[PDB]
């Protein structure tokens, strides 16, 4: 929207406790001035600050070089002064078609004569007639009596150097505080029933997530079992409760008659379901290569859970 305010009384907006969508500000092409001081314009989303101050004013082209740390001049020194250690970016744009008037827009003033330079972020709005000489002005302009402010002849026929530019500097202040203003965060699609490396807010790990049948209180973010292991999380977006199952693992054992009789083997995957790996799912795990039969016999080689294997004709 812009609509920057006057320069002797620049408009300071305090930005806090919010999400700073710097990407909108970065991606558009509406601006001619986007100088940044102390921050990287393309890394702004990753920089969290305690306060962001938006200083809104309109200045002329030749004075844009003055909106910087260390600069001097009629605007930089008597109207809108920036500190030498300013941290933040000045985003300015040509506003000829927004602010300029046919007869000259003189509602915008800058200070030409003032007793001293402004302090960083000082907002001086006095209107006393400036006495340049030793003769009291008593409200009357004249010799050695000059109004401290002067108007801009802003016209649609004016050259660029005399066109208004709207300037808004984002002062980035990091205080001994949580730093509540940050850019937008990345989010991805939820993947169920598969091992993923997950990060839900601050809860990280590897595992399989499934629908939970647990009921969380409105303020509980995750569940933890009797052994301090996270076993459920609330989805930060859709308020679905998901159970976290550690990724299936287990020993791999080879069950075989000796190579003295046959070189054929069967492989048991302990505590692994057969959809995860002659395939026989048993209580001991997934057994691959053995043909399961109904006839019972004396146990030959133990596989566990009452199931035994044997080499038969």
């Amino acid at each position, epitope marked *: 929207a812009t609509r920057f305010a006057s320069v002797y009384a620049w408009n300071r907006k305090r930005i806090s406790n919010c999400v700073a969508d710097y990407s909108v500000l970065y991606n558009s092409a509406s601006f001619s001035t986007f100088k940044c001081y102390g921050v990287s314009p393309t890394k702004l989303n990753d920089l969290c600050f305690t306060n962001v101050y938006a200083d809104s004013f309109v200045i002329r082209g030749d004075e844009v*070089r003055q909106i910087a*740390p260390g600069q001097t001049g009629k605007i930089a020194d008597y109207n809108y002064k920036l500190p030498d250690d300013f941290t933040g970016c000045v985003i300015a744009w040509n506003s000829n078609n927004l602010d300029s008037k046919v007869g000259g827009n003189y509602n915008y003033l800058y200070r030409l004569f003032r007793k001293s330079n402004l302090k960083p972020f000082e907002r001086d709005i006095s209107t006393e007639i400036y006495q340049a000489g030793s003769t009291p002005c008593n409200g009357v302009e004249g010799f050695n009596c000059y109004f401290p402010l002067q108007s801009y002849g802003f016209q649609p026929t004016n050259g660029v150097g005399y066109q208004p530019y709207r300037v808004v500097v984002l002062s980035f202040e990091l205080l001994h505080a949580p730093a509540t203003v940050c850019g937008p965060k990345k989010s991805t699609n939820l993947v169920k029933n598969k091992c993923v490396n997950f990060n839900f807010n601050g809860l990280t790990g590897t595992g399989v997530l499934t629908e939970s049948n647990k009921k969380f209180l409105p303020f509980q973010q995750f569940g933890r079992d009797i052994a301090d292991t996270t076993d459920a999380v609330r989805d930060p977006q859709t308020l679905e409760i998901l159970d976290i199952t550690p990724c299936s693992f287990g020993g791999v054992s080879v069950i075989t008659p000796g190579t003295n009789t046959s070189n054929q083997v069967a492989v048991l995957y302990q505590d692994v379901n057969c959809t995860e790996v002659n395939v026989f799912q048993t209580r001991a795990g997934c057994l691959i290569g053995a043909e399961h039969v109904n006839n019972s016999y004396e146990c030959d080689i133990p596989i566990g859970a009452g199931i035994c294997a044997s080499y038969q004709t």
Partner: antibody, heavy 127, light 112 residues
Framework: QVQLVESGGGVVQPGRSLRLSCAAS????????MHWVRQAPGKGLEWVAV????????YYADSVKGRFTISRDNSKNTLYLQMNSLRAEDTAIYYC????????????????????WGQGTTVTVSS | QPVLTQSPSASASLGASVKLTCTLS???????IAWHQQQPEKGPRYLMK???????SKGDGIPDRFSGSSSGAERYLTISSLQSEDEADYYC?????????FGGGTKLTVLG
């Protein structure tokens, strides 16, 4: 009023090395980008290197890639240029420079501005 | 990496005006540039940045006789009512990916 005062080069044998320095005063040095530019005797300006204010995102002119190294000490407001395996074509005046950072839409990244120049230092490479 | 093409020399009489032209390559056209001044026996000095729309940003303390304008792949430095001190080398520079590139320069000579 900003000022950049380069520390010295001089004469060295080809294949040796030199550390140029650039002392910055009058602005918040640790927030601005910082350049090296050189001018061979009677040649034009040639851009050499640039460094980010923080995160050291260094870039180099290919005529010095592998040999030169840009760095900065923000605690001392000083910019450095380490030259190695110096060559007689490295004979020039070496200026440092500062600037701001802008998101140019034409390259979809951060350009480094060059808005303030130093006074210079002379580097002579000869057998 | 873009390349800047400057005429190697130019001259005009004292009090006249010149239009120094720095045509960047058609590839990477509409890239922004900056103008720098190098007077004899002196270091460089930053003049202004020029955008594709004709909009400049001057440094502080550089006179009004210097104006910039823009057209196609071309960029112009204009100096009105020339003075003895304006005799100098004028380097346009632009940006690429991280790197910056200068042009050959223009030696402007005052014949007054």
């Amino acid at each position: 009023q900003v000022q950049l005062v380069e520390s010295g080069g001089g004469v060295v044998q080809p294949g040796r090395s030199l550390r140029l320095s650039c002392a910055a005063s009058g602005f918040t040095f640790s927030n601005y980008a910082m350049h090296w530019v050189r001018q061979a005797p009677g040649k034009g300006l040639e851009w050499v290197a640039v460094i980010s204010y923080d995160g050291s995102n260094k870039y180099y002119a290919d005529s010095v890639k592998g040999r030169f190294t840009i760095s900065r000490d923000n605690s001392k407001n000083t910019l450095y240029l380490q030259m190695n395996s110096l060559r007689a074509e490295d004979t020039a005046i070496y200026y440092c420079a500062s600037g701001y950072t802008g998101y140019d839409y034409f390259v979809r990244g951060d350009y480094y501005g060059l808005d303030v120049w130093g006074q210079g230092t002379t580097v002579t490479v000869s057998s | 990496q873009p390349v800047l093409t400057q005429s190697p020399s130019a001259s005009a009489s004292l009090g006249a005006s010149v239009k120094l032209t720095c045509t960047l390559s058609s590839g990477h056209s509409s890239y922004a540039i900056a103008w720098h001044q190098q007077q004899p026996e002196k270091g460089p000095r930053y003049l202004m940045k020029l955008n594709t729309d004709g909009s400049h940003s001057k440094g502080d303390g550089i006179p009004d006789r210097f104006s910039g304008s823009s057209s196609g792949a071309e960029r112009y430095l204009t100096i009105s009512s020339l003075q003895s001190e304006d005799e100098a080398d004028y380097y346009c520079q632009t940006w690429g990916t991280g790197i910056l590139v200068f042009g050959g320069g223009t030696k402007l000579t005052v014949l007054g």
